[PDB]
Symmetry: C5
Subunit: 202 residues, 5 copies
């Protein structure tokens, strides 16, 4: 019934970005803030819990919807396939993934990974009591592949996920991707930056 | 003696949900509160310890009660078979499983997993001192499988397990499963939500 | 010299209890209190460090004292053989094993495992200042095997291991194994319960 | 298209330093301070988050730019190749690597590893309030390979990475490599030492 | 050039103590105090960071200095060879190894392991303010092997490694090995006990 798995992994090396030369693997990135845990005004850091949304197309993982019974989509362990090496640029703590590390794959080869993470970032929380509000920037981006290899494209930033209570309230979330040439390598480097603004409830 | 193990694992890939098409693996879910550890009124979080009761039928794991001596049920490591990818939609800390990660299996193929977990959840503990009491919702649910693949069915919520002493006392536990829709993915995702109400003893 | 190891592991699956049908593997259990670290009167929990003493007979692990030079007993990693799945039924934290995870095995097949553990238990430490003293019960027991598969038999509780200083002093340690029956299995269940009584030194 | 990976790992044992005899593997070391988290004046320790810049040449990892399509550089998991066993001599906590553990490799065989680390060091933070400033020395160095096997060569210390805000401000960063001697062995052990001086903003 | 590794591991099982019968593997043990982090007078525990010096002779790991080019000594991961199962008897926290887990081996077969560890011990720190000073005993010893299998021999205790500043100052370090005849089995158990005395600087 599911010899599909045996086949999908057969000739697969997850350390290889599935590019079809000059055809950069495009990954649709998106972050959804769930809650702001703490704010260390003393050391300038915020504890955040978010919901990463990543989707890309792995040509190595497609199959004939017919050659296999009624197998539309399968559930695979991220440790089995290639997954975007996105990293938090201003992080000061290792990311702690809260949810099961599993991804969904199409019969056509479309992967979807939605981990819930709690991670701490370096940020200026000076004006977290002022009505103006403290602003934190969460910069994400590939850690090794450039624009031609891995193309980052941000999608609709969902904010309806934020906790209703919570000691803090969201004043605004921006999100904007930028490509920077970096002094070297003819190839640019993309990155999505979520700008979160919040203030203590009073 | 027990060549049963060698056989049960022979052609098994634990990353594959044991469905036989138009036959969704039904898992009987149930949570039993053991004790409320702490309540962070400052950050709005509760530390809870409970033990989850999960049971399902794995057709790949059945055997002839005769072909094998007097082997009625075996004790296998969850890392060896498929196990429901249930997750706490609203958790803010990785689950810490306290008990041995072993499951029991019938000669017919009925698995049973009863782990004791300590995990922290985001919750509004404002009125934990009021006689009305603070209410927390623990939402659980499959993470990659929809209704047709994995059917969640809640069973009798046991409450006789709660610690007699404890700084807190249980005012009420509800528990109710709902089939909810999410953007994308044609199918809907079943989730069981345990609503716990407690107040500080005084 | 030691092809003994290559042979002892050859046809071994550590997930299989060494029962030779109608011959329940009997494990001699025993706990030795080393020190009481802390007592959280606010949340009702004790931090304990104890010395577990477990011994059983693995028929799969015996050899001819002659066929092998002068190899009387070997030192093997618990991850290599079957080991009792005993669990603390009243624990609120994963057990932290302090010592090397190695076991000793006889030429006849008698295993011995003595790990030092620090674990926290839920307990009523209300009267820890009273001269009467607070009493904690540490209930241990298999997690999946019943009486016919794994027979728990408690042996002499050693108390001479307790720390002379320490903020607390031992008023008494009981220890008593009990078997029961429940709704199911027609299968009984063994469990050893160490009852520790202590009070703050003043 | 990337059978390159299958080939690069084929005859590779990452526990073997890629010295091509009498030609010591030279690794270009460099640290970049990102932020000083806390200073424990009571126990004399600093919590630091730095950027580590390491680059070396692995002759075992080179390939014909032509024999392989347009594969210029690949992204490999440090657990797959040999990587400098540099250690922090005066660390009092295990290093916590924040970024993805991946390295970049040239078609010629030049590896590049840039991990972001948060680690705590033993240091005299007495005068952290004085205008003179507290000074900490972060001594790094290979731990098992001597001068002839692994040659450490420090490069330009980048300081533009430091956090603008932060409770502390950098008064000076030195950095100087020294070839020293030890009471364990008969051989020179090189080591780069970054001397950071900072004071609390007031 | 280094097929030496492929050969050194070929017929090796690291769970087997390398005793060439009637020849107890003698390990030269030695501890060097680096710094005393904290002292919990409330719970009677000290946080210590030391430097373990262990050396022994593994006959299975020797080679012809000629049969292999100019390979004098190699750097191997402790997970690859047998290493003394020494344990901290009165430890109340798992040992946290700070340095790279690698060992050095002679062409003759002499292993050397020098890990830096931070571990907490149960100790009477009552008089840490008195001029007399608090005294802590760090008892180490094999966990499964007795005198005939593993012979512990302490060597010069180096104290020049202690941190100059530090809230505490060393009043004295003794170190003395004792052979402790336990219950049964005529072969006793050797254990080295480092007695450290310190007082708060004032
Ligand atoms: C995808 O699978 C279908 C069904 O197996 C393949 O169809 C074959 O060709 C025609 C069109 O359906 C049928 O008459 C044959 O009977 C099918 N052959 C088989 C093996 O049943 C189709 O060719 C496949 N296409 C791809 C992309 O591989
Ligand atoms: C899955 O593949 C389908 C093609 O059938 C495509 O419409 C979609 O973009 C992919 N994602 C889904 C529907 O989850
Ligand atoms: C099932 O058990 C029967 C009991 O009579 C026995 O003959 C045989 O081993 C098994 N038969 C099949 C087809 O599974
Ligand atoms: C186990 O198998 C038996 C076989 O008759 C079945 O009746 C029962 O519902 C299954 N569940 C358990 C764990 O008892
Ligand atoms: C034990 O080993 C000896 C070899 O000295 C052999 O003669 C004898 O048959 C063996 N007996 C058993 C119990 O296997
Ligand atoms: C081996 O088991 C026998 C059981 O009779 C016992 O006498 C002997 O002391 C044991 N050896 C050990 C565990 O040291
Ligand atoms: C690389 O491969 C080409 C194949 O066209 C071959 O001609 C050439 O000798 C190789 N170049 C080097 C650097 O050896
Ligand atoms: C690899 O790095 C070296 C460093 O000098 C550089 O010269 C070379 O161009 C890089 N790779 C190749 C062969 O292009
Ligand atoms: C050592 O190596 C030499 C030359 O390879 C050869 O005589 C023999 O293999 C070895 N002899 C001894 C005594 O180790």
């Amino acid at each position: 019934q599911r010899k599909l798995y045996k086949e999908l992994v057969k000739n697969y090396n997850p350390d290889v970005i599935p590019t079809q030369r000059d055809r950069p693997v495009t990954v649709y990135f998106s972050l959804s803030l769930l809650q702001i845990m703490d704010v260390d005004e003393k050391n300038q850091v915020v504890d955040v819990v978010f919901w990463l949304q990543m989707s890309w197309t792995d040509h190595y993982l497609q199959w004939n919807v017919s050659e296999y019974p009624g197998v539309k989509q399968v559930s695979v362990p991220i440790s089995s396939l290639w997954v975007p090496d996105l990293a938090a640029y201003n992080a000061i703590s290792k990311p702690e993934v809260l949810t099961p590390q599993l991804a969904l794959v199409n019969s056509s080869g479309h992967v979807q990974y939605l981990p819930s993470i709690r991670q701490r970032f370096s940020c200026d929380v000076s004006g977290v009591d002022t009505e103006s509000g403290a602003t934190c920037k969460l910069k994400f981006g590939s850690w090794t592949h450039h624009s031609r290899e891995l193309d980052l494209q941000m999608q609709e930033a969902d904010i309806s996920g934020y906790i209703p209570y919570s000691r803090f309230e969201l004043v605004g979330v921006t999100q904007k991707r930028s490509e920077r040439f970096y002094e070297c390598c003819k190839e640019p480097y993309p990155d999505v930056t979520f700008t979160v603004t919040f203030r203590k409830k009073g």
